Design a protein around this ligand. Structure first.
Ligand SMILES: NC(=O)c1ccc[n+]([C@@H]2O[C@H](COP(=O)([O-])OP(=O)(O)OC[C@H]3O[C@@H](n4cnc5c(N)ncnc54)[C@H](OP(=O)(O)O)[C@@H]3O)[C@@H](O)[C@H]2O)c1
Lengths: 327, 329, 327, 329, 329, 327
């Protein structure tokens, strides 16, 4: 697997960013881990915490093609986690979200090919499946680009895969942590936008690991989807602090009732496995790939024609307590 | 008596299906100062100036990907129709940045330019595929719509209005399938492509839409996404039409090709406002200057819709008999 | 010659475009033929007609440098036929014509060098010789650039030559076909701008072949000119449909009486051959070339000091019938 | 009494031959608010501010290839003289994109900028070499002229006028041959470069032209290409001048160097309009606002020319005795 | 009664130290129509809209490196505060183009945009490090200041005024050392970083400065570089403060880190104009419209300074007792 | 040392430009010397004077990245002397100076890495030390960039060093030559801005040689400073023409009393040698370098803590005559 390799991750100062740097640091022999991002304050703060010579911090934007080409020189593997993810903000700053996510993905793809990187994994989201909001629309474009990149074939081959998973239990500005800062500062209530608000749930750590495993499976072109549990927002408001009331607030700008992981119209392209899924590409590559046998010799089978992985039509569900056991 | 009296109109990509018809319909039914055709191809542009040979026409070579050009293009324009785009779904799947550069950046430039020149009203053309999309093409179009709607916040003494008209397939449009169904049974009728037996699609006429735009243009406030109520046509039947009897062949689902097109999402119904013959999906954001979309600028009143409604082609009420289409062919 | 090679042709959806793709398909072992152009409707229509796995369609503009670099990866030979050729339109859209033809030629030249292509042939026109209209002015710049490209010398050598020939008998929006669509739709007349209107004439097929032969001759830097026949526009109006009258119409915007192939002031740089000519470069290359012995061991001699290849001062002439035999 | 009263003038590349003279001529004979010199080189610009030391001067460092800069440059200008360019023919042959970037894109930016700032009149400098060209330099200049003339269509409340002044060699200009003929017989007279015995060229004075511009500036409508009637000087004679007797040497025809310069094409004569001391090649296209180029804005009337006319240097009527030039040296 | 009455203010990078405080101070003490926060990070922007939850706020995602965006940003703004920047000296040393792209090109775009939108007054934030600099960061800031001052020449009916406010360290600002001195003795007090025993620095309060800007904003003409008179605090003492007693450790001089910060150069004193509580370094160039910087727009008179003066931190007169800082902490 | 190498120098039509081309031409076996600059008139004039096939003139701007990449193909060593150096003009055209000097330096750095050049020497100035004027501020950024470039490490290594020296005795538009053109044209006076105006002095030739030697010493990352003499402007006005009076004129826009070569706060990073100095980098390179032993096995030692190389606190001084002996 990974050994004496160089890894560059865009937006490595983010949640997935550090939780991933940490895990690669501790569980692998990655010769050098490179964080590529824009803020000097987070990288100054992040260099002092990860006080290890295995690191290296490059200040740069993904909207910058030259910089990326410079930053990716000599890199072996690349994880793309840079992005504007705040759905409401994206609705008010649509070009900003487009520049960062779409153009950003394109430049990363380019710089990777030029530097002959070996493997690239971009981070998607369930919001990119049958999307309604801008953020998701841009992300779907990003996935489309990354999958399509597997067609280029220069004097250097590069595999481009995508990992798509749900809401990361408690993250920089989320819900579960929000539903505590309140009760702490005397929360007058517990706002619940709706009773049907379902959502796939995964942890920072579960995510970081499904990624490092995809690298071990991937042929390039796949869109790996993990089989994660769903949790009714009704049974979550409880845990967090049933005590206080729950003033319904309606619906934020761009929210869905439930999130989709694998569209119904994607069924055919799906292949079930044990812990995960794979949404085979839609286009054909000059060099065909057999997405039925991972590079880990794991065998996967198709799915029923009327297949779809909704957040609610799911069968797994996080007990109204389990999320406290995780807190 | 509402009209586009003595006005300069510019339509991007008006060298194709929608464009040629809209350019014809406007010259015929309205008295607009002039009409500018903005497109890249010199052949089509030349074979259009002849085709029309009308003094109220002007032709500009140009790419929507070009901002300095669009800036000079729109100079002196009152109304802009954005119909330029890459719509060939499977090709968009293989050439994703192309589709992105034209449809996403393209929409952005047309906007940037329209505002610079203080255009009055702008209507952008979307597709049913931009609703809960799954193919790249549709995803760029969803982005596109978002941009034009978001464009309504900008507040300068320009006050441009941006709206979107989203509808489905056009009964035999510039190289599609209807003609590619004749074209075949119009040569060696013995093999007809198919994908599914449940495969449905909304079908509007290359004219029902054109007029729908001119109409949406007359009753807009800005920020709307007008949806024309149309009939759904299950493919199977659409088969016996362009070939009463022939050995059809079930090829395969082309890349990124859905199975049931959505016109209005299930998760956005709370934004829709039903009307007698059309729909209006209100902005998912709030503008500085709010508006009551329940009242078209034509007075037309509107009531919302069932909090669960999902205007899908399959769950459509009306349909088209394999003869109602013959009455189109 | 060409074998197991990859060929990319800009504007391959055009007249010369398909007639060339077809001929390479049928007469060579070209491993892969790549069409590079902007319209999806022509490439969708062109893929279904040339239903052959030897093809590959890239949607792109020549005004786009990144795309070209991507498109030319792994290509062996490149034919440049993309361009805005409508003279009147170019007079009203001068920057458009300049961007496409000049900047377009420059980007193609660049992408070719970066990808180490071996041979590049750009298509010129007689309108580029002692030009008067914009279209021709841009084309002369394109020829100048391509010839000059033979001076670059990186870890990869690339030959850049130009093929310059006249009006292609009946083409997408021309005269001879125009002078029939009329008589068909009851042509009231036959418009003849002038009695001296001479023009070199060649066929789509003759052109496509002189190109594939130049590749076999070329050293890089030459501007091959075929010896084609001239035809008085007076004796052409006849054939097409003498029947109807000929309402003289004057002179279109930018038209010449006759077209030049090899300028008088180019004499010195000329070298006569059997079927063709060669207009040796004006500049000297780091690595001299002997344009007297093609790579086909064909020997050519200079021309008289007062030499010039006008369309009228020519000696060959297409009988007022021959063009019907060709129709 | 026509003047450039209290006006701001900006000349691109006015740090060279034409520029320095025009800058001098305008300060001396007219009362224009100010004069802006726009060029790249700091040395020449500094050695010019001293050289002139005039308060009505302003110097801006800048490349015509730079659009944002040109935009700030022309801000507040009424008249623009575009004299910036790469004219060294053989060098242009070896560095074709350079010449292209400066002469073609350069002309485009100066235009884009002039219109943005609503400049009143713009005169661009062309060369005889842009007539039925064969060298790159001249070909960029033909493109250039086309651009400035085409620039007259644009219709905004700016109404800028764009014209072109095309003439030949300037009797001993910034490093040419006349001085490089002295410079030699001005050191070791024993070897003089030559190309042909029929080699002819039009010759105007670095002052006859400058004034011709100021004049063309006073009688323009826009879209014209003014041609100054000048004398032709067969090289041979021009030899005995800058060296009565010396062993000249026939080197060789430099790259892209013609043998007979054309001022007006044979295929464009039908556009020319002959005048007492100059010519006017009318646009090869039609503008929205037509104009009668037969009447200079100075009332000067004009009759066309013989439908075959080809103002060539060799077929020129007047010439220059090997002493008329001495009366220039 | 001077105020920023009913005015739209936009501050670049107002999502950080200075910004948040300035945004707070202005809302609290003045009645300005609205306030626009222009920055790149969505997290900080969201955690600020909540943090403030004030209707007179607006947040725009954006990079100062982006000119088209800045152009739309500043649209409709009267006053602009440029506080966006990369200031982490040693990081700037390792990523020099980054710092350059943001601080140099960044300042240029904010200017280009401000003029385009006819902003009234613009104040740019500089640092003491831009005085006789040696580190990249400070060198970009010197360039930066030069740009904003030079920006005062441009003369269009816009008449924007550009000034600069340059001061030193901010007593415990967004991750610096003061807090990183607590943070340590606030966990395992046994090792404190040090560089020299002569190491001095000027120290102003994150509030003394903010107000200084609002004040400099009220008494500016344009082209000035306002310098606030502040106290110097020799580091040694600053040590016993954030840790009465602990085993400090002399690590090493971080890259590009000076030893004595300069507020006013020795070679520029002849430009300074001393005031009761501040300084004004006049432009090193002459503008078309001269100004008497000896008279603030607040009437405040000013006398120059000793022709040798060099406002250095070490040669400072006033200082701060290791308790005056405690009275800050 | 240098042999069969290719050298490209930006702004080779300048003072240092020709004096360097000449010296490399005469004292080395440089296979090919390439001049890269913008003006055709200087390069036309410069090709005729340096009438040697070892030359090659490329017309280009440093503000142009493509061109540079083209121009630097196959180059071994690169000297960067292009720049806007007129301090007053830079104060009025600050963006022009920034584009040329800073962006220019960045593009040169980029093109060099892409072409795998081996060594690059950029020319600094004493004005970049503790600067006050724009010109110097941009130059300090240029030095910072060049030093930092030594961190990139692609499939090709490139050393980037800087040479920083004072006013070049009599140059295109300077003082000493100015103080003669006057007396020649009847100089009414001798303007002396101040009595303390000190300045380091070096010759075109001394400079050109310290450069060619640095190439022989350099490890990459150094900022070589030669130990040159200082001259009081009071004792210089004399020589030039004591005869005429000396009307004091004040202080130009951006001038200092004295110029610094090695800042006081740079002491620690300094290393004294015989004829020169070295200001070790401020940052650490992935691959450490020992700046105490040049590549010429020359040993250098540090300097006292209170060290600084001012133009006045200097000990060497050019006799009020020596500059006439040099004239
Ligand atoms: N005399 C002739 O041979 C002749 C005859 C007919 C027509 N013309 C035309 O008249 C015009 C002026 O000729 P001239 O004899 O005065 O030539 P010149 O002495 O070479 O002056 C040309 C000027 O253009 C400037 N320039 C060059 N590139 C520039 C750029 N990229 N951006 C901005 N300025 C640039 C140069 O200034 P910097 O180098 O400091 O940038 C120079 O001052 C030319 O356009 C030429 O085509 C010349």
């Amino acid at each position: 697997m990974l050994d004496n390799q160089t890894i560059l991750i865009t937006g490595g100062t983010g949640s997935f960013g550090k939780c991933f740097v940490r895990k690669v640091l501790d569980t692998t022999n990655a010769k050098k881990i490179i964080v590529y991002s824009r803020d000097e304050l987070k990288q100054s703060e992040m260099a002092m915490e990860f006080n290890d010579p295995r690191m290296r911090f490059f200040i740069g934007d993904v909207r910058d093609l030259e910089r990326l080409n410079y930053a990716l020189e000599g890199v072996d593997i690349c994880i793309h986690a840079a992005a504007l993810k705040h759905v409401p903000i994206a609705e008010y700053n649509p070009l900003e979200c487009i520049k960062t996510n779409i153009m950003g993905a394109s430049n990363v793809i380019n710089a990777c090919l030029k530097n002959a990187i070996s493997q690239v994994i971009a981070l998607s989201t369930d919001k990119a499946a049958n999307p309604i909001n801008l953020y998701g629309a841009t992300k779907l474009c990003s996935d489309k680009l990354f999958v399509s990149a597997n067609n280029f074939k220069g004097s250097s081959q590069t595999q481009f895969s995508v990992v798509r998973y749900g809401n990361v239990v408690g993250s920089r500005g989320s819900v579960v942590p929000f539903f505590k800062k309140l009760v702490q500062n005397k929360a007058s209530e517990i706002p619940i936008t709706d009773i049907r608000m379902t959502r796939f749930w995964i942890t920072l750590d579960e995510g970081v690991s499904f990624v490092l495993k995809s690298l071990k499976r991937m042929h390039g072109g796949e869109i790996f989807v993990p089989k994660i549990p769903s949790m009714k927002m009704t049974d979550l408001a409880k845990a967090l602090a049933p005590n206080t009331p729950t003033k319904i607030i309606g619906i934020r700008p761009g929210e869905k009732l439930h999130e989709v992981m694998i569209p119904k119209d994607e069924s055919h392209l799906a292949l079930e496995f044990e812990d995960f899924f794979i949404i085979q590409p839609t286009i054909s590559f000059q060099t065909p790939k057999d997405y039925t046998l991972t590079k880990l010799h794991e065998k996967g089978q198709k799915v029923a024609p009327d297949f779809e992985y909704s957040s609610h039509n799911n069968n797994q569900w996080l007990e109204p307590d389990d999320l406290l056991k995780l807190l």
